[PDB]
Q: What sequence folds into this?
């Protein structure tokens, strides 16, 4: 059973998700338009500050509290959930966990308050996201950094409220490039299978200059810093993917009670009711998986293995429940007007981002000695 | 081994698919634009007339030749493949199989030559596509049919070359009425925002007192739904072939991508996790292909092929869905980008489990064939 | 994280499982011989008394404590685990939860101490285990009950230490038939796919007489009593099935480090190491599933839905991990000498007993309104 | 449609399987007793001589005819089917394909007529079945080969009618030596306690200074493992057919059981959960059958069939495993009772994913065929 503080938050975000987020989800998906009005209301709720102390502007909660919110948002609109997830985990977290009093005090308050978004630029075109692959070069001249390179698939990097993008550059540490830096160009959005409302851009740097004080962490330790906070993001996206799986149940249950076939609701036929029952089982064990992962994290125990399992299994519950949810909806399962249709498109990236399934299996395998 | 005539057609459509269809596939998907220039090239190739006798403008072939062509188109662009499949199976076939000499001579030559497209309007909003569910009424007043109702998810019903849409209508007496496009009560509503098949033409249809000549009654008064039920199996074979091509296309792309893309100094195809996944993908497409070849073989021998087609369609559609999820995995982040074929195959393929009889409907048929 | 009391018990039974149970598992499986020496040592540990108060002879623990023990035993030998599971859940539990001070004081102390075993006879040949199907008739004459009928697949019903079999009989309540009752005949064991060492018998009753005081619960309420304690058994077998899944990982990990192919251990090839990594994920989420189920039960909250999901998912983790574990072992996967081979045979019944998968899906479906 | 000769054989073996093999299948499984009376009846039917020319005692048929027969035997009893499959593929075939005129005339007539059984001893304890792993040495001393080593999991190597066991031996020069049974150093160790195939004869073999004539060298000195690798594909087809029969047998049994067994007043086959599961089972067996038919068709046309056989074998073995797990589910508690065919199919089928090249080996082959 969930404690009051967490159960109260779950109820508030879920209420938010049904009353505020769901009515506009179809519009932003069709338009590919970033939901600024939803992000600002999430910011005023403090969701962007949940896993941060009131010191730097956060709400003094934890990552499990954020996880509960992401599950409730994931049920309804993945683009909104991933904007929150990526903002906290990829924008603010590298600055909060590796930035001095000045860096944290300059950038975090806006990020933590939902007034601004930050992104992390690691992936590059043609590069294998390894340490060996990073072809983006950075050179120090006096009190300013000079960056030359290109990044690919960077979330939250080109909104009207993006303040900075922390990037990786071979010198390899983490450098905070404010948006508006002359060499910093935000290329146009991608045409993606899904997450249509989520902001995603390629980035290019031609002799961009930023202050010396913008180095994130110690010179040479930025990639190591990233790996050390990856595990919280596996939990966060496991919760998002779990919400997706549950949203697919919820919609399919709703749809099965309305839609008729040969005089009875389609849920009266075992093939539909059993398929939905299995979907609810998948979502449930996905939820116990990431609760267990968060429990270890909050207790200070190791949670890398549990998070990797939680993320893989969750992502598979979302994909499987989306394919089943669209089957339950029939022709409507092929119409972007219906939530489960958008979930079918959106969920493919859940098996790929935050470490591919193959990466999670490698981690689990190494944990056994293989 | 495949006989010469069929291997020749397969090779020609494959060249067509790689040289003509693929280069423009990305533009049409992004734009949601109907590929008129591709449909015109398919029409001159004879593909819309492949299973129809020369008398009406056809090529004197069969549904297997059409299935071979659909597999090659499915590899590359599902919207183009389903435009052909629906044009033949739902546009020309109901007029060729149940229309009199006049109906056939007036409508088939343009359809069979690809100069026009035809649609079949059965599904309605709120209805379970049964005969008991058909709320679209058509009323005889003098010498004209007066139709009031609405159809949903009708393919090929609103292109610049759509000539007619045959609909099912209560007259529970259910007949089929040929509604030419341009009929005053006939409104083609705006396109749907669909998960996939972005380039394929799909519309809701509405009829507010549309009047058409009495000679437009297709088949016997009251037997139009029954006639539709009787010719369904060829389309199951046709779409199993399309889904088989999708499954194969996902393999082809993943193999090329796996040989180029690098990870830790070796192409990702050097790792068993990728190469075994692609090998399994290739196994799925192969047995899907043997399944629908057998269904067509029985059809061509004049033997029963309902059960074999139902299996071919189910297994094929699942090979497409599974191979699209694996192919996008192999492509990594690129698998989430509509510029890549496999990403479009992941979106497009979901309707393959739903149309031409849902998986649950195929399982029902197979079950009944066993005595269940 | 697990509290000390539970973690201590988990360590003791696991130690028991490796040192006492595993050395004799192959012998009893080959011989189809009931492991009396293992059952007596489990009894002296008090495992048969774990979910019962010290009052009636039990150890004053809970069903979760029993669940932890069953997982550790399930890892090694299903026949031993199911003997414990069925003894507690089907022998003692109907008497503990529905028997008067005298009935509990007469029978439970031996059951709870592992000195005796009791079974539950509900299934009948040709009957669908519904209330409508029970063709076994019972008639009251004076101070004795007279029973006529036949039962099928009754666990623990014909060992040298079986004291009684509580049965269902249409009159429909629960009647305690002591072993040795003249009309009570124990037919010979079945040749089963698996659980070779587990005791299983058809039962036949031709005018057997037992005292009036032997009525279990109220006349007419015995089947209702059974349904009301079914949910604890779903948790118990979910834990057993989870242990099986983990045992298959453990053995496959052990085997993958020893067995060579083309100069390297077979776990160096991704196809083997990834398959084992997935197996560990299945066992892990099965374990979070039934922990969650037990948590609700111990808190007094409803746990029927959670138990049904836990049992289904667990049983599927055992079957899937057994098929993968035998693949990892190659030809040895087809040899009853190896634990994972016995797990492949044994696990089929996990999808069937304690409510079939179809029954669990029906329950989950009804919980959603379908 | 199947040609007359093949349909005739299929019908005959099917009658055999239902009339002769099935009634005794339960007794042999419980007893672990080799079915000599079944093997003698198969021998007089010619099944062990089906793919061998008349000259050596065979029936002048092919491996497809044998595959058809194995599918019918697999439906009913896998131990009987694998006795035939291993007898032909591992006993007679290596002598027919690589032995001189004398070797063939001395050993093939009894094998091809079922009066004797032969085994192939390659696998050894601790070895990865590679040539580099073969630790069994055979030494030429005067005119006799002196063999020291051990073989593991050797089918048909210890029956009352086993005549010989061909083994692989280091001479890393690897040759094949024909060891007749009764040779002084040749010890047939006691049977294994196996998960399934309880009635099929399986033994570890040990050689402590066994001497056999020099004329027993099979093939060229040093080429015996290479020869074995070259004839593997026919056995993949043969066992895909066996696994296909297993898959079909599980359907057949589940259909009969589903029509009789009741639940809440209707047979369990009236519920979609059971009828759809059985319909899917039927789909799996059908596409498995189309897969291995295509592999055999290519083989018979003289075309490459390695890739097609590998797919047929993998997909077949998985159809058997999946259908056995579903069929035992349909049978409920009875699915856990060795008296029922599907329960025995659940135990027997696991080795179908492991023998005749593991699933991982088939995926490797398919992958290599794509350039991976
Ligand atoms: C883009 C596109 C294009 C087309 C079409 C759709 C789309 C999206 N269609 C319509 C399509 O054929 C139709 O939607 C499908 O047959 C599915 O029917 P329903 O949506 O009514 O599902 P329906 O409402 O029948 O069923 C929903 C779900 O319940 C299941 N189910 C239903 N009855 C059941 C039962 N008794 N037991 C168990 N499960 C059961 C189904 O299997 C499905 O999963 C169409 N139509 C047309 O008229 N002309 C056209 O040209 C096209 N083309
Ligand atoms: C919408 C969206 C949003 C984001 C991102 C992507 C997208 C599409 N990303 C990028 C994302 O994290 C990245 O694409 C994934 O890590 C996958 O990397 P590749 O596409 O290079 O796959 P890659 O080339 O690594 O691999 C392709 C396939 O091969 C497999 N594979 C690779 N190596 C293997 C091996 N050794 N053994 C076995 N299998 C192996 C992988 O598992 C995968 O299935 C991102 N990035 C970023 O920097 N910042 C951001 O904010 C975001 N956000
Ligand atoms: C009852 C019975 C009957 C017979 C046989 C076995 C049994 C049990 N056999 C032996 C059988 O053919 C053999 O066991 C299998 O080929 C499997 O080989 P291993 O046990 O060595 O598996 P092995 O040790 O090769 O492999 C174990 C596991 O690792 C995997 N693996 C191996 N290498 C890998 C790689 N490089 N990459 C990825 N995965 C890899 C395999 O796929 C498998 O899952 C036999 N033998 C014989 O000589 N004569 C006979 O008549 C018979 N008949
Ligand atoms: C070794 C062992 C040990 C035990 C037991 C069995 C075995 C083999 N059992 C019996 C066991 O609990 C029983 O066999 C199962 O409940 C399954 O019941 P049936 O075999 O009658 O299946 P049944 O006939 O109910 O069903 C067969 C199949 O159809 C499905 N099905 C049935 N009705 C359906 C419906 N309406 N909709 C959809 N699908 C449906 C089921 O899910 C199953 O897959 C037992 N019994 C006992 O009394 N005491 C004991 O101690 C034990 N222990």
A:
């Amino acid at each position: 059973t969930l404690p009051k503080e967490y159960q109260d938050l779950r109820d508030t975000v879920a209420d938010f998700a049904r009353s505020v987020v769901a009515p506009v989800s179809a519009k932003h998906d069709e338009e590919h338009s970033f939901p600024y009005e939803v992000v600002a209301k999430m910011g005023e709720m403090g969701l962007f500050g949940l896993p941060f102390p009131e010191e730097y502007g956060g709400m003094g909660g934890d990552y499990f509290a954020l996880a509960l919110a992401l599950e409730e948002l994931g049920k309804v609109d993945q683009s909104v959930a991933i904007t929150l997830e990526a903002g906290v985990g990829l924008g603010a977290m590298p600055i909060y966990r590796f930035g001095n009093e000045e860096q944290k005090s300059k950038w975090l308050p806006d990020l933590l308050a939902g007034r601004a978004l930050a992104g992390f630029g690691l992936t590059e075109p043609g590069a294998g996201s390894d340490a060996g692959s990073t072809r983006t070069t950075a050179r120090l001249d006096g009190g300013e950094w000079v960056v030359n390179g290109s990044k690919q698939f960077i979330t939250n990097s080109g909104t009207d409220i993006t303040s900075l993008v922390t990037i990786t550059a071979v010198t390899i540490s983490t450098i905070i490039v404010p948006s508006g830096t002359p060499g910093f160009i935000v290329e146009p959005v991608y045409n993606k299978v899904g997450w249509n409302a989520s902001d995603t851009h390629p980035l290019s740097f031609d002799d961009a200059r930023v202050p010396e004080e913008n180095l994130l962490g110690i010179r040479g330790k930025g990639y190591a810093n990233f790996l050390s906070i990856l595990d919280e993001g596996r939990i966060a996206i496991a919760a998002l993917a779990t919400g997706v799986a549950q949203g697919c149940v919820d919609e399919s249950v709703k749809y099965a009670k309305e839609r008729q076939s040969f005089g009875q609701p389609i849920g009266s036929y075992q093939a539909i009711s059993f398929k939905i029952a299995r979907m609810e089982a998948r979502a449930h064990v996905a939820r116990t998986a990431y609760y267990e992962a968060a429990a270890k994290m909050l207790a200070g125990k190791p949670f890398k293995k549990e998070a990797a399992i939680a993320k893989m299994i969750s992502s598979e519950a979302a994909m499987d429940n989306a394919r089943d949810a669209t089957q339950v909806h029939g022709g409507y399962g092929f119409m972007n007007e219906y939530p489960v249709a958008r979930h079918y498109r959106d969920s493919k990236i859940l098996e790929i981002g935050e470490g591919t399934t193959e990466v999670q299996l490698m981690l689990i395998a190494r944990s056994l000695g293989l």
About this structure: The pocket of dihydroflavine-adenine dinucleotide (ligand 4) is lined by residues A 270; C 86, 90, 119-123, 128-129, 153-155, 192, 195, 200, 349, 352-353, 356, 358-359; D 261, 263-264, 268, 271, 273-274, 329-330, 332-334, 336 (CB under 6 Å). Chain D has three domains: 1-117, 118-220, 223-372.
